[PDB]
């Protein structure tokens, strides 16, 4: 899986990618995973970005990787079925939220939020 992040979107994610101790997760909010037990959870099985530290246990669950121009994105293997091979994260022109689209599915998540679960 691959993801392209626009300039405006990367800039908005800069404050996190700048944290050497930070890791990005493309989470499928379904209550599955130890991380769901941390922080808010809208268990409506939707996509969202989570930022954790390299000390939290995200490995066992977010067991797969997505290559991207701003670094890696970890995700739960199974949710792969809800993704696209070539996706994109851009910045909404209407609101300050991000957007997640796929080459074959179109909009996967029109309003992609960001959650900071770093200690």
Phi, psi of 70 (to 5 degrees): -120, 15
Phi and psi, residue 42, nearest 5°: -100, 85
Number of domains in the chain: 1
- The dihedrals phi and psi of 104, each to the nearest 5 degrees, come to -115, -15
Neighbours of 50 (CB within 10 A): 26
Domain that holds residue 53: 1-119
Tokens of 45: 């099985």
- Pairing assessment for the beta strands 64-68 and 2-5 based on DSSP bridges: parallel
CATH number of the structural domain spanning residue 67 = 2.60.300.12
Classify strands 106-112 and 98-102 as parallel, antiparallel or unpaired: antiparallel
User: In the chain, which ranges are E strands?
Assistant: 2-5, 22-28, 47-53, 64-68, 73-75, 86-91, 98-102, 106-112, 114-116
70: helix, strand or coil: coil
Instruction: Identify the experimental approach.
Output: X-ray
Residues in the chain: 119
């Amino acid at each position: 899986l691959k993801i392209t992040v626009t300039d405006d979107a990367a800039k908005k994610l800069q404050r996190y990618t700048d944290d050497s101790n930070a890791v990005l997760l493309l989470d499928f909010d379904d209550g599955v995973g130890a991380l769901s037990k941390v922080g808010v959870c809208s268990l409506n099985s939707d996509f969202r970005i989570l930022v954790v530290s390299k000390d939290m246990d995200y490995k066992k669950d977010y067991n797969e990787v997505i290559d991207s121009n701003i670094g890696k994105f970890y995700y739960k293997g199974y949710s792969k079925m809800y993704m696209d091979d070539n996706m994109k994260i851009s910045l909404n022109t209407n609101n300050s939220l991000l957007r997640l689209t796929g080459d074959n599915s179109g909009e996967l998540m029109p309003a992609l939020s960001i959650q900071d679960f770093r200690e």
